[PDB]
Amino acid sequence: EGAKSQEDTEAVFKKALLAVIGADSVTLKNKYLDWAYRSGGYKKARAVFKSLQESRPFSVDFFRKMIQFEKEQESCNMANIREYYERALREFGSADSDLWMDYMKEELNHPLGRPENCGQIYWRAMKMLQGESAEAFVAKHAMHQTGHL
Amino acid sequence: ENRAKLEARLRTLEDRGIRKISGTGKALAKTEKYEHKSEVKTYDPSGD
Amino acid sequence: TRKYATMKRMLSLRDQRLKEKDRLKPKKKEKKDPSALKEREVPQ
Amino acid sequence: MGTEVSEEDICNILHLCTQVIEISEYRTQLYEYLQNRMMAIAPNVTVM
Amino acid sequence: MAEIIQERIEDRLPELEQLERIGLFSHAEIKAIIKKASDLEYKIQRRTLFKEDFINYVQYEINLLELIQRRRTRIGYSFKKDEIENSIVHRVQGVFQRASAKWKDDVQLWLSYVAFCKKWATKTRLSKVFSAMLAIHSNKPALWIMAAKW
Amino acid sequence: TSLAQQLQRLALPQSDASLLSRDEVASLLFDPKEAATIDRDTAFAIGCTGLEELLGIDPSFEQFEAPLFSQLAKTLERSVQTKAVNKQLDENISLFLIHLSPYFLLKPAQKCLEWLIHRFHIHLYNQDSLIACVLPYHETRIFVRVIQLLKINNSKHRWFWLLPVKQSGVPLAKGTLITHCYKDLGFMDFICSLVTKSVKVFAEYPGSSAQLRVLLAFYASTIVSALVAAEDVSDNIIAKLFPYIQKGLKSSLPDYRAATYMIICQISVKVTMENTFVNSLASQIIKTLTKIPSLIKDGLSCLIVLLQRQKPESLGKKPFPHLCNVPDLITILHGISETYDVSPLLHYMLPHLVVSI
Amino acid sequence: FLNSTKAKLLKLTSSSIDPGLSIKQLGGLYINFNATQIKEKKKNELLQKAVITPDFEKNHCVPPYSESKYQLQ
RNA sequence: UGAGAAAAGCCUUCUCUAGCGAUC
């Protein structure tokens, strides 16, 4: 990135994804998306995200990055906001309490949101969450109803 | 869209099942017999 | 709701607060269960 | 309580344990492949 | 039930009555001490026993000893140490011996007993305590080191 | 059986059987068999730990350290003291429950409630306060447990309609709550009094708007729904609701005013109202508008609804000056006009404007 | 208590004897001699045997509060 | 046999073992 053409940087990344196939690819994919937004624009990040959305070893930082790029854009298509969160909740919904909480605040705080969906998201959150994570989500939301956040 | 519709129907089904057990709620508390208080003190203005 | 042929509550003869000699009868009927095993003592 | 194991015995146990983690790692890769094909051929069914 | 408890409370009566004679403790304080002493005594005479109860009993007696020690200096009365102080010390020693007999495996209780013997008890009692410790816990060199250090 | 009824009516919580025996123990956290094997020191430790956890979250709990969570509270047993001491204890417990109500879903609040039940038997002495504390959480299972602690078997009891959720162990359904709210007026008065009392308690502490969120939402939800549920809203409902509506209008808390606005809108939607009552309602809506500057718009829009679902000449000339004197009236009216119809307000306000000019 | 000797008052050696184990390395003494650890453990163990459990919200019907002896048998 | 016989739910009176307790 520092002292070579952008096409070679993409060439390096594509070789890297072929070489590493297991859990170590998680950090590789995250830096690939971050480079796409810096070297390109929002459109370039969309093409990279579309290609890598099916390579199953993931992390929640992959989807938090994509949502963040959507917020910075002036369009802020709220339908695309939901479409990213559903994919993230499909992968890590069984264990991640924070991701469910972040989803609920988006429907409230975003000016384009529909807060009448908060009834369903809380109902959906209870069933997919398992074990200790179920307790933490309840306390965090009850902490969210009060102003302490 | 089909998935979200089922969860809308599934939520309503759970609430209706709870309502059947809980009851209509139309009934109120029943009335109670009253017995007068005895040995009640009073004031007689004849003494004035 | 009304009851007929009523009798006053009295001590029963099968109460165990009575002694075994004084008690009338255990009033127990035993049925040989089909599944129950038959065991006998037969000297060889 | 266990008995001491020879050097040749413990090597065989490691080789068997080596195959176990390699099959399990492949099975996870096979499962991820299945999720890729299912979302490509019949995506509406997978969501539901 | 309260047969043994009543024996122990009547054993505890004379030093409380002497303390009333000193003027150190008022009569209501004596009543409160008797009440809490009976409550703590009922705990350690049950058929089901816990170590927490023995520890609470010992801690209450230590706190009472400290309170008496603080009040004596302010009053200036130094007589009749044997009637009160030594009686309480023997009662606490009996409690410790019973507790150590119940739980031999707990070194921490043994060290608490040793510390109390150092602070309030005669050196021969501490010698016997160290002998009893080294009888069953000979496999720990640190205990030998502490015994030699003393 | 007349002796049986007389004895059952003569029963009192002070003479409870469980007071004199340890076969059964009421506990929010443990099975009765397990709860009958815990000492006073353990319960005191749990209560103190819960309060210490709660102190970090909210400082204002420190005032409860001395009366309810100290050695004096440990040795205290209500039966032996007089009625004055019991009344003071009831006041203190009510205040503490008002403070606990927002955090009831958190575990430390449940620990503190466990200590209070173990020591003071508020399930026998303070049924109303406990029910008021737990009511906005009626969908949760911990509400089911708190109900299960009570004894409401008698069909003449105030809370007898809560019997199924005790017998079946299921949360109370909102439909039953709404039906009993609109059919039985004592429960509605209970809800309104609880809301007013909690607001007055929390008013003193600056920056305390957040804790009253959930409760007010519940107060917003049922009453409107109750007004929807009733086939005919009789004059008793409006007579009961009017003082609390005025109290809400005179308040300064935004959520309480918002709930009052929703109640006023729904009442105006459902039932035709006498001209004097519409005049007074509009007078109170207009006069207290500028107390909260962030809720001006909704209030004006509320007025439109009140002036759209009622008779055209209901409003008089008296509220006209205060209407004209609000800051930036026309800008707000234009902002509303970009999306919604503003015809009734102008239809009222123009003929007075001509005469005033 | 662990190291407070009168030989410390009468300094006669540059050093003292060091037992490797310390009071702080252990849980500490059970008793205090001036102006609670086990009671924390009893409080924690009792809390672990609580009927309020994970998935308590998940449960559709709460188990009954109390049952007669005849029904249990 | 003849408080006829048969079944369900609530109180009362009591019986057995098995740990536990006695070490100061």
Curated annotation (Swiss-Prot), chain A:
Subunit structure of this chain's protein: Part of the small subunit (SSU) processome, composed of more than 70 proteins and the RNA chaperone small nucleolar RNA (snoRNA) U3.
- The molecule here is called U3 small nucleolar RNA-associated protein 6 homolog
> What family is this?
Belongs to the UTP6 family.
Q: Where are the HAT repeats?
A: 40-72, 76-109
Protein task: Part of the small subunit (SSU) processome, first precursor of the small eukaryotic ribosomal subunit. During the assembly of the SSU processome in the nucleolus, many ribosome biogenesis factors, an RNA chaperone and ribosomal proteins associate with the nascent pre-rRNA and work in concert to generate RNA folding, modifications, rearrangements and cleavage as well as targeted degradation of pre-ribosomal RNA by the RNA exosome. Involved in nucleolar processing of pre-18S ribosomal RNA.
Task: Indicate the span of the full protein covered.
Answer: 449 to 597 of 597
* Annotated localization: Nucleus, Nucleolus
Q: Which organism is it from?
A: Homo sapiens
Q: What phylogenetic lineage does the species belong to?
A: Eukaryota, Metazoa, Chordata, Craniata, Vertebrata
UniProtKB/Swiss-Prot annotation, chain B:
List all Basic and acidic residues biased stretches: 29-42
Tissue expression remark:
Ubiquitous.
Q: Where in the cell is it found?
A: Nucleus, Nucleolus; Nucleus, Nucleoplasm
Reproduce the UniProt comment on modification after translation: Sumoylation is essential for high-affinity binding to snoRNAs.
- Covalent cross-link site, Glycyl lysine isopeptide (Lys-Gly) (interchain with G-Cter in SUMO2): 26, 30, 37, 41
Q: What does this protein do?
A: Required for the biogenesis of box C/D snoRNAs such as U3, U8 and U14 snoRNAs. Part of the small subunit (SSU) processome, first precursor of the small eukaryotic ribosomal subunit. During the assembly of the SSU processome in the nucleolus, many ribosome biogenesis factors, an RNA chaperone and ribosomal proteins associate with the nascent pre-rRNA and work in concert to generate RNA folding, modifications, rearrangements and cleavage as well as targeted degradation of pre-ribosomal RNA by the RNA exosome.
Q: Which family does it belong to?
A: Belongs to the NOP5/NOP56 family.
Fill in the subunit field for this protein. Core component of box C/D small nucleolar ribonucleoprotein (snoRNP) particles; the core proteins SNU13, NOP56, NOP58 and FBL or FBLL1 assemble stepwise onto the snoRNA. Interacts with NOLC1/Nopp140. Interacts with NOPCHAP1, NUFIP1, RUVBL1 and RUVBL2; NOPCHAP1 bridges the association of NOP58 with RUVBL1:RUVBL2 and NUFIP1. Interacts with PIH1D1. Part of the small subunit (SSU) processome, composed of more than 70 proteins and the RNA chaperone small nucleolar RNA (snoRNA) U3.
Q: This chain belongs to which protein, by name? A: Nucleolar protein 58
Gene name of the record: NOP58
Coverage of the whole protein, first to last residue? Answer: 386 to 433 of 529
UniProtKB/Swiss-Prot annotation, chain C:
**Disordered, as annotated region:** 16-41
Q: Bias category Basic and acidic residues: which stretches? A: 31-41
Residues making up the signal peptide according to the UniProt record: none
- Localization terms from the record: Nucleus, Nucleolus
Describe the subunit structure: Part of the small subunit (SSU) processome, composed of more than 70 proteins and the RNA chaperone small nucleolar RNA (snoRNA) U3.
What does the function comment of this entry state?
Answer: Part of the small subunit (SSU) processome, first precursor of the small eukaryotic ribosomal subunit. During the assembly of the SSU processome in the nucleolus, many ribosome biogenesis factors, an RNA chaperone and ribosomal proteins associate with the nascent pre-rRNA and work in concert to generate RNA folding, modifications, rearrangements and cleavage as well as targeted degradation of pre-ribosomal RNA by the RNA exosome.
Family per UniProt?
Answer: Belongs to the UTP23/FCF1 family. FCF1 subfamily.
The protein's name in its UniProt record: rRNA-processing protein FCF1 homolog
Q: What is the lineage of its organism?
A: Eukaryota, Metazoa, Chordata, Craniata, Vertebrata
Curated annotation (Swiss-Prot), chain F:
Which branch of life, at top level?
A: Eukaryota
Modified sites of kind N-acetylthreonine: 1
Give the UniProt subcellular location, in the record's own words.
Nucleus, Nucleolus
Q: Report the leader peptide range.
A: none
What functional role does this protein have? Ribosome biogenesis factor; required for recruitment of Myc to nucleoli. Involved in nucleolar processing of pre-18S ribosomal RNA. Required for optimal pre-ribosomal RNA transcription by RNA polymerase I. Part of the small subunit (SSU) processome, first precursor of the small eukaryotic ribosomal subunit.
What the record says about family reads:
Belongs to the HEATR1/UTP10 family.
Additional information: The protein described in this entry is essential for the tumorigenic capacity of precancerous glioblastoma stem cells and their proliferation during tumorigenesis. The protein is overexpressed in patient derived glioblastoma tissue compared to control brains. Overexpression is more pronounced in high grade glioblastomas compared to low grade samples, and expression levels inversely correlate with patient survivability.
Assembly information from the UniProt record: Part of the small subunit (SSU) processome, composed of more than 70 proteins and the RNA chaperone small nucleolar RNA (snoRNA) U3. Interacts with MYC; the interaction is required for localization of MYC to the nucleolus.
Q: What is this protein called?
A: HEAT repeat-containing protein 1
Q: Which gene encodes it?
A: HEATR1
Q: Which residues of the full-length protein are shown here? A: 2 to 358 of 2144
